[PDB]
Structure 1
Amino acid sequence: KIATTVGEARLSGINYRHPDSALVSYPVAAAAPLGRLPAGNYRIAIVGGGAGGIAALYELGRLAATLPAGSGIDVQIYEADPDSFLHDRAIKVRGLKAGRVSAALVHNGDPASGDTIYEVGAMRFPEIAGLTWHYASAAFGDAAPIKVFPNPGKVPTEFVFGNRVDRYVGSDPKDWEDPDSPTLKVLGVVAGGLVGNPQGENVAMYPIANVDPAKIAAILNAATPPADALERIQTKYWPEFIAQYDGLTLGAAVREIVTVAFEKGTLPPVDGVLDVDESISYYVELFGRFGFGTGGFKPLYNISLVEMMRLILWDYSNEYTLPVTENVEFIRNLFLKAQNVGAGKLVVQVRQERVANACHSGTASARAQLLSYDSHNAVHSEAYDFVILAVPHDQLTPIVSRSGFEHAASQNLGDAGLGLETHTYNQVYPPLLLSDSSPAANARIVTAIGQLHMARSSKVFATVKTAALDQPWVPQWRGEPIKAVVSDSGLAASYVVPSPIVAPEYSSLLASYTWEDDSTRLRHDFGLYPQNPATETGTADGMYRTMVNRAYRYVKYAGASNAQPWWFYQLLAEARTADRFVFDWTTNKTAGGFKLDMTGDHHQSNLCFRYHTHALAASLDNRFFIASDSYSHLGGWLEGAFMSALNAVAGLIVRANRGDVSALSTEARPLVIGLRPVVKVPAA
């Protein structure tokens, strides 16, 4: 059944537990305030006003409301992005960003009467993203309507790889133009081999607990599993999967699966003519371009099988939209709701400042220091009781890695190489303080953060009349125009998304949404970085013409006598001249789009995911928590940012209670105690 409201989606994934946190359903943990704080007047900083920082603010507001008369929380939120919604009370971006939730409003002079929205970052939300939908309910209510995201396969789709063309909806051969397609056949082989069957015989190549992944997904998503089953997944079976397969790439796993299927005769020689290795390779690459429901994962073939398996267990591709004009509205509404729930006990101030350094210093009550620069490069220093560092890993690195790894009598911190003013701190310890006695422990967390993999990504947009889809040369599936195109043209994945400002006259032509090497191949043509146009009134016309030129390819369709230039070239050219656009996340200060783990990376990302458990070590007294999708096992999803925020606040509560986990609610306790601790000594 298709979910139709926020509440329907919310309930669908409410119990789902991810395999690295299999003892807890984050939505259940988040149902009530996470815990209790001692009486006091707290001074907290949140660095970053994206999904992570704003979810953390919301949870702090819920905590604040439980404080007794005379107590409260003050939060300073640092947000360097001048386009953040936090600083706002033709293509417009000002006020339309919340980090990587980022809209561009296409208008003709009056932004209150726009044509369309480009969703530059986050855009499609898994049904089983339970924490995402929990917060969407807080922001919009359960009754608010949602739509199926128009992914390849969800709407009529054209797929092109090499000489192969397909036109399809879903996976039922009755809905494919060629029901005998090799593409659909290889999908079945690769899906059988990776996911397997929820009932009956185990057919998957890479079992978890000796069974198909499908069977484990059903346990992870149960209300009342075995408890014993979740513990065994958490402590035994998922760790054993990691031990076996964290060194195996997705691309290698696809090839293994295809090889066995080819040997068995489930897949035929390609064309009847290619030799064994050529046939296997063709199928591997065909599947690579086709994907799992959101376009080709070829560019993602270097991720570990472990990372892919997380997405498989989550049924990640089954996605919806939010009940918004622009996705940034979600984060803005959560910010406003934070302030409302705090019931007067939370006070929030926004600083348009870039944090340059964090440390612990001095001997005062508040020892968590932040050094920042304002928009005219003036320096500021402030000390806090606790700090949540809600920025992704490459943005976190300069803040946490330049103070060394142990006690220092004095340091002059700041951006001295930029010629900016430094600040002297005394009796200095690193911010990410895992040990009082081991510089290597402090170095492990810093070095791990700095070597996480930020996947590269870019989006090319234009504005097109929706009626362009009705041109005679746009193909149809049962009378509905093709609205998604997945191709090896260099464009990778393309979408003709109806404007949300409304049938709408205009659509957002997401001409190219690329990852990893697909993005690298395009980057030389972008012209201006990270955004072309850099101005509200420019147009990235030259850039966009290079994308139309990539689509200028002769494509042969079955039964046709000759190839003609691809119809998609014609569609791209139908976009208006004004408002052509590219955003390159790679050349944004994030240094890419979102974390995806390579082989071996589990050790690094999982350390970050578990970092908040430092709060168990009472005498350590570390005041810094981290909150981003970079510090999760769902990089590239709001779910990851939100999970990491929940971890950070849970840890903060434990720390504020000097290591006492009974200060967490019963439901929230496993956020801390269901993970391996990052401090072995001291115990707690």
Structure 2
Amino acid sequence: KIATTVGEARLSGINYRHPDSALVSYPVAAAAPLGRLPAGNYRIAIVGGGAGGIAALYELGRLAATLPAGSGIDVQIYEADPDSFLHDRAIKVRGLKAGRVSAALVHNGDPASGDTIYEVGAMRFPEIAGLTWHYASAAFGDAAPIKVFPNPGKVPTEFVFGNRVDRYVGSDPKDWEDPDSPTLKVLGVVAGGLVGNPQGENVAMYPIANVDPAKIAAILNAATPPADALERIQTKYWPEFIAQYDGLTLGAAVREIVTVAFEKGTLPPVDGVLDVDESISYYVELFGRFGFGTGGFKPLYNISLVEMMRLILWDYSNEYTLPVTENVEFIRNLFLKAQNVGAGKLVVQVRQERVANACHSGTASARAQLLSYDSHNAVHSEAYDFVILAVPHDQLTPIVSRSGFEHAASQNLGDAGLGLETHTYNQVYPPLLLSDSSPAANARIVTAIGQLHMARSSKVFATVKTAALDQPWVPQWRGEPIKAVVSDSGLAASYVVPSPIVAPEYSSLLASYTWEDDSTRLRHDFGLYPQNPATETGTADGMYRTMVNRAYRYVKYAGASNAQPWWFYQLLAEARTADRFVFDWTTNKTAGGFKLDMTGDHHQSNLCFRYHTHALAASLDNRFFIASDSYSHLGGWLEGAFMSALNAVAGLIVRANRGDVSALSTEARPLVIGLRPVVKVPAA
């Protein structure tokens, strides 16, 4: 039941509704242009040329094509990253980034004849990511082939935690080297306790609407559910799950599940020597390192259960690749498609400028101001009709938080502490304008944004001959070498990914992909930040040797007499010297990889997710929208960036129509009216 084309994946998830937006399938909303605009010549800015900004541009292009003769849309896209694809028409990165969709091309002096690609950011795409596949179809066509991402368990995998080793594929004990493994037993207990059963008895510990989450997932993914059922999930049952469990961490939930299983006798004493609490703790930590299909979630144990449950409902781990050499091609293709679809009515200019401030000011028709600096620090100011701020939360903070929270007669905005030139704005209001009357409403949105949690992440890469996998010391599973390794060595998760530039001679050795504390623990060894090498011609050899040295561990295998150094040390050492690499998202200007919500964070991220509903308040006249995975309930996924873009453009349409929701398509209207409004007064 494996999808083989973009269209197959697209259709698989076309109906899926997420539980915070249960009244709408975003792919259905996105099928036709989102609405209509009054006649006019619009001047719009998009800050950020990542997935969110480019999806927003595409939707604007679709809108532009519907405008009558004499009307049109001009977009200024601001993109500060010198390596963005937008500024481009050994390890090469120049022109190979679209924000956090970021490739590194390994070559020997001719980039048109490379060895492999490192996917430094996004790399694996859930089957049920329906908006992602909708845009992949726009970019590449339904016919384009996709592959199963070689996740732990999708390819032969070695797992190591403490004294436990496993070698496996999937979850059928027939496919495990040790079918009696305690690791597979704890997986079944934790899956049972978190997901439960789609049919029959409810066995999950944390029900939604009094039933196992599996049963709710089937309703969220139906073509014709109850309408009544979707509204009840939206307004009653998911809010009640949040009220109950938003204060419970994933790690706490795992321990609750394991405790009950241990008391029932479903899980036996470990070694039968450990006492009750040591056994339970061992199982919690074993599951922590093993995970849900993408490696250990131990480092993610502080997320809310609500956040994990979103991923459970989505079947997040069932992932595919894109029909590309480099994932940045997706975003580049969407940018080109935006310009094509605008059919002459969309004009786009790219600015290599960093936006420092946004506000509303003045008394002219265009009041949405952006203050920016070019690559030699010269200041620029421009006013727009509407602005989409398509940057993640730590990048948005300085832009929206330094103007105060209410009317100001005059402000000199800009990066004064840097020594840079300021600009005087008059009759100034905050850009994220939720009230004409409330500074507190304006402060709530800003303070929420600034306190969202950006998960930390790093990726260590090297280039290895694929034939290294055929060495006698590389274990096999039914003749196929092990190609994923999940471990407590400090490396966390490692993958030997065939080169997409092609059986390929080379593989990308993702030696370590870490989250959260696992990333923190390595960071002292990276040497140069955010990228080692910082140059095209360097190699991060010293850094990488510290990773090889973390793999230099004596690993005992069952039946063997004595431990020997781990074979994976030998594999890591087979990578060539040149082109060793690390990228640390934490010391990138994103200040991490992507939003993941902690306990209590729902209320902050959900405010952001609903922000575009300000467009219902007609007299407010707020011209700023936000578009990033940080303003979604899928931080860490293109799906989140894309959903937030959709929200932003939908809201822009309602604002352009002075609060009239009838200007949205029938299918798009729920993007705005299916959420709780962010402005209670005035109504609309």
State whether TM-score is above 0.5.
Answer: yes
CA distance in 2, matches of 1:502, 1:344: 37
* 1:552-599 Cα distance to aligned partner (Å, 9 max, x none): 000000000000000000000000000000000000000000000000
Task: Look up the SS of the partner of 1:512 in the other structure.
Answer: strand
Cα offset, 1:402, TM superposition? 0.0
Cα offset, 1:157, TM superposition? 0.1
Cα offset, 1:399, TM superposition? 0.1
* 1:342-399 Cα distance to aligned partner (Å, 9 max, x none): 0000000000000000000000000000000000000000000000000000000000
Matches within 5 A, 1:292-307: 292-307=292-307
* 1:60-83 Cα distance to aligned partner (Å, 9 max, x none): 000000000000000000000000
The residue that corresponds to 2:387 in the other structure is 387
The residue that corresponds to 1:347 in the other structure is 347
Give TM-score, length-normalised by structure 2: 1.00
Task: Look up the SS of the partner of 2:43 in the other structure.
Answer: strand
CA distance in 2, matches of 1:8, 1:334: 20
The residue that corresponds to 1:365 in the other structure is 365
Cα offset, 1:234, TM superposition? 0.0
Task: Look up the SS of the partner of 2:501 in the other structure.
Answer: coil
Unaligned runs of 5+ in 1: none
* 1:404-453 Cα distance to aligned partner (Å, 9 max, x none): 00000000000000000000000000000000000000000000000000
Give TM-score, length-normalised by structure 1: 1.00
Q: How many residues align?
A: 684
CA distance in 1, matches of 2:531, 2:207: 44
Cα offset, 1:316, TM superposition? 0.1
CA distance in 1, matches of 2:316, 2:261: 25
* 1:315-342 Cα distance to aligned partner (Å, 9 max, x none): 0000000000000000000000000000
Cα offset, 1:244, TM superposition? 0.0
* 1:577-626 Cα distance to aligned partner (Å, 9 max, x none): 00000000000000000000000000000000000000000000000000
Task: Look up the SS of the partner of 1:424 in the other structure.
Answer: strand
Cα offset, 1:531, TM superposition? 0.1
Cα offset, 1:680, TM superposition? 0.1
CA distance in 2, matches of 1:443, 1:281: 42
Cα offset, 1:115, TM superposition? 0.1
* 1:193-229 Cα distance to aligned partner (Å, 9 max, x none): 0000000000000000000000000000000000000
CA distance in 1, matches of 2:226, 2:545: 57
Cα offset, 1:630, TM superposition? 0.0
Task: Look up the SS of the partner of 1:662 in the other structure.
Answer: helix
Task: Look up the SS of the partner of 1:496 in the other structure.
Answer: strand
Cα offset, 1:165, TM superposition? 0.1
Task: Look up the SS of the partner of 2:258 in the other structure.
Answer: helix
Task: Look up the SS of the partner of 1:270 in the other structure.
Answer: coil
CA distance in 2, matches of 1:587, 1:157: 31
CA distance in 1, matches of 2:374, 2:537: 27
Cα offset, 1:54, TM superposition? 0.1
* 1:515-560 Cα distance to aligned partner (Å, 9 max, x none): 0000000000000000000000000000000000000000000000
* 1:97-156 Cα distance to aligned partner (Å, 9 max, x none): 000000000000000000000000000000000000000000000000000000000000
CA distance in 2, matches of 1:91, 1:288: 34
CA distance in 2, matches of 1:319, 1:410: 51
Are residue 27 (structure 1) and residue 27 (structure 2) matched?
Answer: yes
CA distance in 1, matches of 2:272, 2:302: 30
Cα offset, 1:301, TM superposition? 0.1
Cα offset, 1:163, TM superposition? 0.0
CA distance in 1, matches of 2:238, 2:89: 45
The residue that corresponds to 1:15 in the other structure is 15
Cα offset, 1:304, TM superposition? 0.0
Task: Look up the SS of the partner of 1:449 in the other structure.
Answer: helix
CA distance in 1, matches of 2:150, 2:74: 42
* 1:295-318 Cα distance to aligned partner (Å, 9 max, x none): 000000000000000000000000
CA distance in 2, matches of 1:634, 1:249: 17
* 1:448-498 Cα distance to aligned partner (Å, 9 max, x none): 000000000000000000000000000000000000000000000000000
Task: Look up the SS of the partner of 1:3 in the other structure.
Answer: coil
The residue that corresponds to 1:512 in the other structure is 512
Cα offset, 1:633, TM superposition? 0.0
* 1:249-303 Cα distance to aligned partner (Å, 9 max, x none): 0000000000000000000000011000000000000000000000000000000
The residue that corresponds to 1:585 in the other structure is 585
The residue that corresponds to 2:652 in the other structure is 652
CA distance in 2, matches of 1:369, 1:609: 23
CA distance in 2, matches of 1:294, 1:189: 18
* 1:629-678 Cα distance to aligned partner (Å, 9 max, x none): 00000000000000000000000000000000000000000000000000
Task: Look up the SS of the partner of 1:448 in the other structure.
Answer: helix
Unaligned runs of 5+ in 2: none
CA distance in 2, matches of 1:660, 1:571: 61
The residue that corresponds to 1:238 in the other structure is 238
CA distance in 2, matches of 1:2, 1:19: 25
